[PDB]
Amino acid sequence: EYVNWTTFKANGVNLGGWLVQESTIDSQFWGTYSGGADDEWGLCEHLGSRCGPVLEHRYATYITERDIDKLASVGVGVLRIPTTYAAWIKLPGSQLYSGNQTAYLKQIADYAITKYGMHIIVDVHSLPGGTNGLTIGEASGHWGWYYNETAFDYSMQVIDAVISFVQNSGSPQSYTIEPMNEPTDNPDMSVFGTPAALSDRGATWVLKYIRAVIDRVASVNPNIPVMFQGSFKPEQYWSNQLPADANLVFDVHTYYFERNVTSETLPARLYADAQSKAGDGKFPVFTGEWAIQTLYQNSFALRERNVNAGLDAMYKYSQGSCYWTAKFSGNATVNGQGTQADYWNFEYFIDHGYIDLTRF
Ligand SMILES: *[C@@H]1O[C@H](CO)[C@@H](O)[C@H](O)[C@H]1NC(C)=O
Ligand SMILES: *[C@@H]1O[C@H](CO)[C@@H](O)[C@H](O)[C@H]1NC(C)=O
Ligand SMILES: *[C@@H]1O[C@H](CO)[C@@H](O)[C@H](O)[C@H]1NC(C)=O
Ligand SMILES: *[C@@H]1O[C@H](CO)[C@@H](O)[C@H](O)[C@H]1NC(C)=O
Ligand SMILES: *[C@@H]1O[C@H](CO)[C@@H](O)[C@H](O)[C@H]1NC(C)=O
């Protein structure tokens, strides 16, 4: 059956650091191969002709079917899989690597679908020209996507390629298409993650894009849902700019590592945030990214209580959540106990008995 996000709910993880590279998720990989760069773009340019071979090895090893087995053993029902635009098109001028990403995407997705019945969110994290000035949007310092007709044309070709992948998957009812991630045009980094990170001028271009995508997907298969990561606005900001019959679910992201909160007081914040992001009911809401690290006083002991309290909150007020991220080994210190790898690594929660998603 095709998924209807006004009734469907699921709990799962992101597969971060696998087909999109980021410095924080694997400290050992980034130290060895980045050459000092802070984005995937610069890591790849630094490696030159060796970029492909290195990344192809990572695609084959960082996430495998054994990792999927471990996720299923606790009842994970949804995988959010970030990809770069370079997995889908070969953009002239780009320093991101265009290789066999979709071959690994299919092997892993087919397995999670066939063996365990999981749903797959295919996330196009970056778009040609850059959507947010950050590595995840294309490259550090790139905001060239906005108002750029050439970049717009290439972006729709990206979506055409995702549509075909879903249509020829053998199970198109298993996929949700997410055509962008965290678009922002505000250069002040202290306002990232907040509504002011996207101007109204930039929002008109985002709306142009998301309506073009809604129409293009529906023209091929009106049953494939579209997931709109509407930057850091509330769903109510977008809901009256879109026809009610769009097959549309909103993806909101909720983090706490730069907010004045402690591990002790985190559950109150998790419940408040899920309540305020529940939306107006014209379209449903999914919490596609979250994590339990707080800015202050991080506590090993409270990890089990806090991750389970987040799962509770996002399932009660919304359609569920995907943790960031499945596997994480970055060793940056945090305030209080430990490093980020003690709080962003979903595998540790599974391995130490914190997770039983069948209780929902
Ligand atoms: C999803 O369910 C809602 C509520 O019944 C309905 O209005 C909507 O048309 C359904 N989606 C599709 C694609 O039929
Ligand atoms: C973090 O991990 C990297 C990779 O193993 C290592 O080179 C570095 O020394 C570590 N940093 C700290 C502060 O432990
Ligand atoms: C990518 O996949 C194709 C199709 O199997 C294969 O022929 C090619 O050698 C692969 N390239 C790399 C770099 O693995
Ligand atoms: C427009 O987008 C293209 C495609 O990525 C990019 O190469 C170019 O630099 C962009 N132009 C501007 C002015 O940002
Ligand atoms: C964070 O909050 C605590 C109490 O909630 C307050 O004492 C502290 O000053 C705040 N931090 C900053 C930087 O204002």
Please render the helix and strand layout as text.
Layout lengths: L9 E5 L12 H7 L6 H8 L3 H11 L3 H8 L5 E6 L17 H16 L2 E6 L24 H19 L7 E4 L21 H21 L5 E3 L6 H5 L8 E9 L9 H11 L8 E10 L8 H15 L2 E4 L22 H6 L9
Parallel strand pairs: 1-2, 1-8, 2-3, 3-4, 5-6, 6-7
One 2-acetamido-2-deoxy-beta-D-glucopyranose (NAG) binds next to loops.
Please give a structural write-up.
The strands form two sheets. This protein has a five-stranded parallel beta sheet with strand order 4-3-2-1-8. Strands 5-6-7 form a three-stranded parallel beta sheet. Strand 3 (119-124), helix 6 and strand 4 (175-178) form a beta-alpha-beta unit. The chain is built from eleven helices and eight strands. By secondary structure, it is an alpha/beta fold. The protein has one domain (1-360). Helix 4 packs parallel to helix 5 (101-116), helix 6 runs parallel beside helix 7 and helix 9 packs parallel to helix 10. The protein binds 2-acetamido-2-deoxy-beta-D-glucopyranose (5 copies). One 2-acetamido-2-deoxy-beta-D-glucopyranose binds at residues 91, 93, 128-129, 144, 148, 150-151, 154. The PDB classes it as hydrolase. The entry lists the keywords AoRut, carbohydrate, hydrolase.
Key descriptive features of the protein:
360 residues; alpha/beta; 5-stranded parallel beta sheet; 3-stranded parallel beta sheet; 35% helix; binds 2-acetamido-2-deoxy-beta-D-glucopyranose
Q: Determine the fraction of residues in helical runs and give it as a percent range.
A: 25-40%
* The number of domains: 1
Provide the β-strand percentage band. 5-15%
Q: Total number of helical segments?
A: 11
Q: Are any ligands bound, and if so which? A: 2-acetamido-2-deoxy-beta-D-glucopyranose
What strand line-up does the widest sheet have?
4-3-2-1-8
Distance between the termini: 21 Å
Encode the helix/strand succession as letters: EHHHHEHEHEHEHEHEHEH
By secondary-structure content and strand pairing, the structural class works out as alpha/beta
Quick one: how many beta strands? 8
Shape: globular
Radius of gyration, whole Å: 19 Å
Q: What summary fits the major beta sheet?
A: 5 strands, parallel
PDB class: hydrolase
Keywords: AoRut, carbohydrate, hydrolase
Assembly: monomeric
Entry title: Crystal structure of AoRut
